[PDB]
């Protein structure tokens with residue numbers, strides 16, 4: 063597998079949340095999430111990544127007019143993450159195109175960019191079914207210019223992304239731009255969509271971003287419907303005009319149909335197998351690119367939920383993938399219920415992991431009181447390998463075999479170690495001091 067790198071050349075293992083669905087409907091575009099909430103997340107789970115939801119409607123409230131005050135607010139939040147050593151992926155998020163689909167249900171595009179052409183959007187028994195209503199299908203068909211009536215819309219979208227990239231190009235905490243949440247093709251579905259207008263929008267948007275930001279990873283998603291459930295994607299390779307190596311990453315989601323017991327469990331387990339095979343294939347098509355599992359999640363109160371979550375994280379580990387869990391929002395899917403009580407997720411996610419590796423991690427494992435990591439060396443890297451150790455299992459000092467301890471910060475929970483680069487692959491084992 064391939065990895066995103068920090069400025070020191072270290073390979074990043076990214077673990078965090080989507081923050082947050084509450085931003086979708088907020089008039090000011092910000093999630094209901096405070097700096098104290100982040101402090102709690104970090105204290106409880108030691109996360110190092112966030113998929114932070116932004117919106118086209120907040121970036122470009124009128125055609126060609128970008129809201130710099132909104133971008134100030136995003137920058138403020140990014141600062142909270144920066145101060146705690148997080149890396150940030152900005153997600154241009156939408157569901158069902160826009161809030162403007164009913165006079166709320168959807169989110170994303172500004173009202174001026176929403177053209178339903180008078181076609182109906184009647185109430186449906188679940189929100190996903192709004193996607194196939196005449197007015198919503200038309201809004202998407204207009205956006206992709208399948209109708210031929212709105213070539214300007216993708217151009218606006220690309221330049222809205224350029225405005226965001228212009229603000230964040232020099233932001234050391236931002237590592238990735240997730241160009242579009244869960245692309246939906248309207249009347250176009252499958253390869254005709256993914257290899258057609260979807261790939262074309264990604265290329266235009268990448269090109270626009272690269273006018274102002276040469277180094278941030280541009281992350282592209284397949285269409286969500288079908289591919290979320292383990293079907294193959296027809297997405298094609300996107301060119302990165304940056305000087306040097308390509309910085310495109312693949313950001314699919316995973317949402318098995320049965321969602322964890324009985325035949326449902328078997329169906330979900332083979333879905334993971336199919337999803338892995340397909341994800342690996344498309345990551346190759348895109349140029350042997352890094353993978354970020356941009357979303358997966360479920361009601362943690364469902365029997366078998368822990369086994370599912372642990373299998374997904376194990377699969378992500380084997381694939382060298384980052385993970386942003388859906389989501390930090392309060393409720394049974396998230397790490398905390400509305401009153402602040404921890405769900406199953408906290409103890410499940412709160413495990414040792416390597417955050418930034420001085421070399422390519424070839425394999426690793428962890429339990430509550432042990433981490434083992436094998437590193438393919440890179441002599442050019444002078445920064446230490448950085449590892450998270452939970453206080454639960456590591457209440458005092460560390461015992462490290464296979465590396466020299468550089469520092470052990472018992473407050474931030476960051477262990478830094480140094481390994482030789484001229485002795486082949488190195489295995490580092492970390493356990494609690496006696």
Ligand SMILES: OC[C@H]1CNC[C@@H](O)[C@@H]1O[C@@H]1O[C@H](CO)[C@@H](O)[C@H](O)[C@H]1O
Nearest residue numbers: 083086156157167168169189244357388
């Ligand atoms: O259904 C869970 C997520 C699937 N991937 C896209 C995410 O936006 C979804 O989050 C849900 O979105 C819905 C529409 O905005 C919203 O009503 C729910 O509260 C979200 O959990």
Ligand code: NA
Nearest residue numbers: 173174176177
């Ligand atoms: Na409109």
Ligand code: NA
Nearest residue numbers: 233234236237
């Ligand atoms: Na950056």
